[PDB]
């Protein structure tokens, strides 16, 4: 496993997902940092300094994207899976043992927000994902640690 | 004792009132009076209320958010000493914190719509001054639109609405009511659908059926929408202002490959006014598109004029066009005639005829002997109608239309030893070109004129060469062209005279090759008492047995450019003949290009 | 209601029906005036000077055309209905009250001729209709009266 | 007591062993032990054998040709004091004289295969030395390949196998084992199928789907063959050596009009490795084509660069090209730009840009005022990927890019009676040609220079002729061309001076027509103290009111070929003007060609 290629690949997966979200016109107009009530459980922009938190973030994002019926987001879910697996292999190349993050045990609540107000949930979740990805790419040179 | 009321349901009205409803038991053939017991359990106050109602429903004003409604109903015979039923099973309905009124609005483009909202924060109703509205989470709505109806409730008013543009799956625009900077997940749905649907109809040329079409393109955005054309038939003609009628009937319409719906009216009432509109039966509500009235007689597409004939009038030379008016309509019609030279692309000239009793028109044409394509179409003379399709092209047949305009240009070869009084003169001409022949030349006739034998004529048929014996002192010859109408109007003559053959007026003659395609021949004239009409230049190769080439040139000309293949190595003879009324003069001849 | 248009329209409806009958090849060859036994009840060429008689004639024609199964004649029945309604509106524009003519009460007999000999009934009824229409158009300028 | 075993079948293994098989009765929920009774009846020896087996099958080693096998089976409960079933019905199987082992081989190109055979002649096994092998009855196989494993059996070994070419209906090559010259009807079937099937994939420019294709051309020879693409998805990237994985899934592939199969992967995992292979499920056996691994990111076909703009930079004159990188991939890219003159066929020049942060490039072009077509395509800068399609052509707009390079060449007509001190001078020029105008000339301005009035300028607009009054002893005129940037850099001047008009330096002048398209004009110069810059030759027809034609010629020139239409019969005037710094000198004039 080439180490240099994996960091560059990490960059590439992040940029691809960011562009995917860019294609989604409604998400672009929505403020990433801005707080919307009810969605607080989704891990939005809060400093993601280390590998275990980023991994759990991607796990939660995977759980959110799976539940919402949209074609673009699903293949994107595919991109997120490759990104997570890539993060695990990089964590291995640094001699770190990353336990496979489970998603949130507390999903019995996310269903409610999706039924009552779908629009807020999708636009917020995607825009915060885009923000988180930018921070991920930013931090990927800082020599991330486990 | 009636059975307890069944099917106890609770719905929220667009006004935000709680409508409790139930069904009467199906087995009572008499009206029931109901007693409704309900409790409203909020976090701070319990209210119980018993209401007696004769209707199968009750409104409870202003549903309180974050409250629990328990409901029971019992029935009794309305008339007489009826026994009460037992109570219905209690039904609980738990409400949400945030109220929009209305929750949804279905409108058309250009309308005005307004919403009211209440925002609950920890079991408290916030002041309206705090409430701010947002659109699609993208941007804040301008403050000017907001209106404070009361301290608790805020309202937004929209004017001159534009069609909602769909973003992905969502057909509607999400409107939010927020407490300052922070918003909540729940939003209001705004559905604006373009009801401006164009329905166009066309009556067939036989007035046997009526065809109507309309497009789906504005409505492909709403899944679950069903579309039904409705129509109302008037007894006579269309009203000045079309309107939706309460009594309407549906029409079976079929989606075509081009994406348009087709509605067929068969058999037809020629003078009945058909009012049409589209019924959009959304899951919540019915919307009617603007109604339009169509008169089948005013939307008739007539058949093209039949039996179109194009002939050029003999002797006159006009393109005479005729046709038969299509059966419908029998009302006065105007006609449009396009005509042009037949080819791969026809340059159509237009002509319009507004005389109702007109069946044929005559139009001057520049070439009488070409095939013209001609198509005709018709429309109601008053303009109230559509244009018919263009008729199937008619083509002219080339026929002679006048006698030939001009007789052929001819020259002579003289075969004769200088010692004989008699010489064979072979006249030679080319067939007339289309402009001079017009259409055809059937035969050539040679008119001879002499001092002794007078005038006679010899029929040469379709031959382009003729040889006669020249014996007399003066012999004038004229070649006529004859077609089925007669002989050519303007004919060339040539007088052969023996005294005059000594007269020489061409002082010098020179020929200079400009290139392999052009030689200048120039000459100088001496003064002459005879009135020269024109020259003929004759040239031939002397190295080949080439045909003697010749050309007629005006007497006003002193220099000519002969365009022919001239080989500078070969010896060409150039003969310039001066031509006078008394006949062809003595030629000046040169046998070489002038090298000087 | 334009008066001039209604008279011209009356002309147009009559001419249309006449042409319709012209399309029916078998009717053209049959003499309109000629008498055929059994059909005498149909109001054939007998001078139709006034509006009430013409209206009743169209009513009888409507009854005859309805009973015979043929596609051309039926839409033509449609043309006859517009013509009758038009005659009523014109009779109104002249301040005349035209009572709606009922057809013949005596239709219990027309059925018999249609079953026993259909051909004679259709060709005669249509050709006489065509004749009656020509007389109608002729009389429409004479200042018809009620 | 179990039911007797059912379905007793007998098949020959590729090794030539007799496999007797049966089914257990379906109603026993416990294992059975079986007893098989069989007899083998050959022409010379009878053998009976009873075998007890726990399996539902028995192998009998080396089936004897021309023998009859009778078989019966009975079952008993394996565990405990079970009762035996009755015997199965006896089954007879009669064998043939000649054995090939194996009877058939299915292999791929480049493999090694070997067959063994036994040939029976009148109930006797022949020695292997006698056996000879033949191919398709056409020819004997070389002796070197044969190997004698034992006295009774012979073997052939094939190496570096090539694809079997089909002869008519037969897909396989027939291999024969013969006793010397004479062969037998029965043969062995050899099936070699090209498993070398190229599967190519392409990711769409939006990274929304993956397209895979493969050809049928090598496999149209086998009827009854079914083809199934199988794939295995890796978690990340492709392995260095692709291999068949036991856990695989099929893909739905559809045959296209071009004869290729299409397999669509939708939605996509940008970084998952797709291993593909073709499963060929022949009636006897499954073969897997060589597996290939494809990385979707490395097989992306990017979209062409969008928003391509081609403009020529004002003042600078470079073809500046710009574009926008296509969204994918966002990785560094290299670009290829083709540019050429716009026409029916564009001579494309190539240029490559490897700077990732480059969005626009400026390339010198020879003609600034022509329309160039320009197309751009992109590829991953590291080379790991495909080239995008060429962008939609961009075209330049002709705009002025510099001031005109050169002012127009001009001459003068002098209209004036010799007795007047004042003369009208009409200057005449032609519009600048594209190379001198570059793109456009908006206006001409005439700069006048005199000793008394100094310098002034007169705007002539777009006129090509101007008339001024010449009054002074010396008047210099200069014509400037002006465009939207400014005036022409290099301009012609002409000084009109009255003293100098008497100076004559042209001793002789002669003109000789070479042809109707060329006249030589030659002149001899006298020595002169004035520095001659150039000549102007002027010629006109004297027989026609022809426009005065003129041309500027270097002073170094002593002979010139004028290409124009010259009629040797007409009188031409040729005027040679010597031009000095002080102005136009006295012309030498000739009015005829020199005949000497």
Swiss-Prot record, chains A, C:
Subcellular location(s) per record: Secreted
Tissues with expression: Adipose tissue is the main source of leptin. It is also produced by other peripheral tissues such as the skeletal muscle. Expressed by intercalated and striated tracts of submandibular and parotid salivary gland intralobular ducts. Detected by fundic epithelium of the gastric mucosa. Secreted into blood and gastric juice.
PANTHER family per UniProt: LEPTIN
Gene: LEP
Example GO molecular function: peptide hormone receptor binding
Family label: Belongs to the leptin family.
Gene Ontology cellular-component terms listed: cytosol; extracellular region; extracellular space
Intrachain disulfide bonds: 96-146
Known function: Key player in the regulation of energy balance and body weight control. Once released into the circulation, has central and peripheral effects by binding LEPR, found in many tissues, which results in the activation of several major signaling pathways. In the hypothalamus, acts as an appetite-regulating factor that induces a decrease in food intake and an increase in energy consumption by inducing anorexinogenic factors and suppressing orexigenic neuropeptides, also regulates bone mass and secretion of hypothalamo-pituitary-adrenal hormones.
Major localization listed first in the record, in broad terms: secreted
Disease: Leptin deficiency: A rare disease characterized by low levels of serum leptin, severe hyperphagia and intractable obesity from an early age.
Keyword list, A-Z: Diabetes mellitus, Disease variant, Disulfide bond, Obesity, Secreted, Signal
One of the protein's GO biological processes: regulation of natural killer cell mediated cytotoxicity
Protein name (Swiss-Prot/TrEMBL): Leptin
UniProtKB/Swiss-Prot annotation, chains B, D:
Post-translational modification: On ligand binding, phosphorylated on two conserved C-terminal tyrosine residues (isoform B only) by JAK2.
Principal cellular location given in the protein's record: membrane
Domain Ig-like, chain residue ranges per copy: 96-194
Effect of residue 187 to H: In LEPRD; uncertain significance
Region Leptin-binding, residue ranges: 232-249
Glycosylation: residue positions: 41, 112, 162, 281, 389, 424, 453, 462, 493, 515
Consequence the record notes for mutating residue 551 to P: In LEPRD; uncertain significance
Family affiliation: Belongs to the type I cytokine receptor family. Type 2 subfamily.
Domain statement: The cytoplasmic domain may be essential for intracellular signal transduction by activation of JAK tyrosine kinase and STATs.
Function statement: Receptor for hormone LEP/leptin. On ligand binding, mediates LEP central and peripheral effects through the activation of different signaling pathways such as JAK2/STAT3 and MAPK cascade/FOS. In the hypothalamus, LEP acts as an appetite-regulating factor that induces a decrease in food intake and an increase in energy consumption by inducing anorexinogenic factors and suppressing orexigenic neuropeptides, also regulates bone mass and secretion of hypothalamo-pituitary-adrenal hormones.
Protein name as it appears in the record: Leptin receptor
